[PDB]
Every structure is written in structure tokens, then in C-alpha cells.
């Protein structure tokens with residue numbers, strides 16, 4: 244049974260006004276929508292179930308993981324509807340778009356970088372405390388509200404640790420951001436997210452992850468065999484050390500999310516999230532051209 248599944252008599256085309264496409268998830272297409280009862284904006288993920296299966300388990304898993312999260316740092320899930328062969332997944336709308344989108348007008352400053360990383364860390368701390376691993380941390384999966392709030396999204400490949408399953412070994416993620424132990428399919432846990440966080444830190448600083456000019460297949464041997472990436476360029480030493488802390492080949496040498504919240508880069512540079520509205524305004528003016 245799918246968590247949050249609504250009465251099959253309920254017609255989502257009547258309950259929601261479906262508007263323009265705003266992106267593509269690991270599964271399904273995502274639209275801006277209006278809740279016709281409250282008039283709030285929602286995000287609507289639509290998946291065609293007849294074209295799918297072999298992905299249906301994964302879709303169920305994503306919804307299950309979402310339904311089990313209750314955090315200001317994780318996109319809220321409002322339920323699912325079936326219309327003929329299509330599943331409508333109703334999600335919290337984050338009007339600012341992704342951190343990746345917000346990078347298009349130009350570089351971030353280190354206050355912005357620290358603030359976004361701090362909020363991602365709050366989300367990871369929550370997830371890891373719940374014995375969940377995101378496994379696809381990257382700037383495209385970091386979403387901002389219109390108020391500058393920062394939340395984690397796309398739990399399409401998220402994993403769950405139990406007391407009989409202390410580690411995972413599944414090959415999932417986005418290659419440039421994947422930890423060496425995940426690529427090698429060694430036993431791994433929440434520390435894999437910390438590595439991905441390190442890559443995301445470089446992405447927020449430089450605009451792209453390491454190896455971004457290479458074919459994804461090449462990083463399948465490059466990441467396990469090479470020394471870890473470092474942040475190159477004129478960035479503060481605390482930021483460079485934050486990145487180095489995350490990007491260690493030995494998972495036990497990586498700090499926890501909780502520990503990184505106290506890292507000197509974060510404490511010295513992060514400010515209130517409301518300031519990130521400037522970043523949204525910049526994007527708005529930019530795409531206005």
C-alpha cells in the first residue's frame with residue numbers, strides 16, 4: 244500500500260489546477276499547480292504507471308521515505324492521486340527553484356555558500372538521525388522557497404538503515420557526486436552523503452562538480468582510484484578545509500553532519516536564510532534579461 248494514496252474516486256484534475264512544467268525528477272515530470280480548495284501553489288509530480296514498472300518499487304520507496312519525513316528541511320508530501328494510468332504526487336512548492344538554477348546568473352559569495360551548506364547540513368542531520376541516507380545530494384536537489392528557506396528534494400534513490408541492515412551497498416546516485424565506496428559498492432552509510440556534500444560545496448563555489456567535462460563512465464574508475472578532489476581557486480581556507488573534511492576516501496575520517504554545523508567555515512560565514520531572497524531576485528532579474 245502506497246502512503247498518502249487518496250480515494251481513487253478523487254479526481255486530481257478537479258482538485259488541482261495543473262500549470263506549467265517546472266522540471267524532471269529521477270522519476271516523473273514536475274509541474275507547478277494550484278490546490279483548488281486552498282488556492283495554494285503546489286508542486287505536482289506526474290508519473291505514467293503504464294510506461295513504468297521496474298521503477299514502480301522505486302516510486303513507492305520515494306513516497307514512503309517522503310511520508311516518513313517531518314522536517315522544515317525536507318520537501319513536504321501532501322498525498323497521491325490516481326487519474327487513469329497517471330499518478331499525481333502532490334508536493335510542497337518551493338518558489339525559488341534549485342540552488343543549481345540560482346547559479347545561472349553568476350557565482351555565489353561565501354556567505355551564500357555557507358548559508359546554503361548550513362541548511363543542507365540541517366537536512367542531512369535530520370535524515371541521518373532517522374537512519375535515512377539521501378544518496379543524491381547535489382545543487383539540483385537543493386530547493387529554495389520564496390522566503391529563502393532551503394530544503395532537500397528528490398528522494399528517488401534514498402535508502403533506509405535498520406537494525407538488521409546497518410549498511411547499504413546499492414549503486415545509486417549521480418556519478419559526479421557519488422562517494423568512492425558507493426561506486427565500488429562497498430558497504431556504506433550516511434557518510435556517503437557527507438562526500439556528496441563535499442562535491443556539492445565545490446559545485447556551489449565553482450558552478451560545476453569535479454570532472455564535469457568528462458564522460459560519466461570515466462568517473463567510475465577515476466573517483467575510486469584518484470586522490471579526492473580539492474577546491475581550487477581563490478576561496479577562503481575555511482571553505483577549502485570544509486571541502487577537504489567531506490572529501491576523504493576513508494568514510495570514518497569524514498565528520499558527521501552534526502559536527503559540520505560547527506565547522507569554522509559555517510560559523511564564520513553563514514547568515515540568516517532570509518538574505519537568500521537576494522539570490523532569488525538576482526535570478527528573476529537575470530532571466531527577465
Ligand SMILES: O=C(Nc1c[nH]nc1-c1nc2cc(CN3CCOCC3)ccc2[nH]1)NC1CC1
Pocket residue numbers: 264265266267268273286318334335336337338339340341344386396397
Ligand atoms: O520536486 C521538484 N521540484 C519542486 C518541488 N517543489 N517545488 C519544486 C520546484 N521546482 C522548481 C523549478 C524551478 C525552475 N524553473 C523551471 C521552469 O523554467 C524556469 C525555471 C522553479 C521553481 C521550482 N519549484 N523537482 C524538480 C523540478 C525538478
Ligand SMILES: [Cl-]
Pocket residue numbers: 350448449450
Ligand atoms: Cl566560478
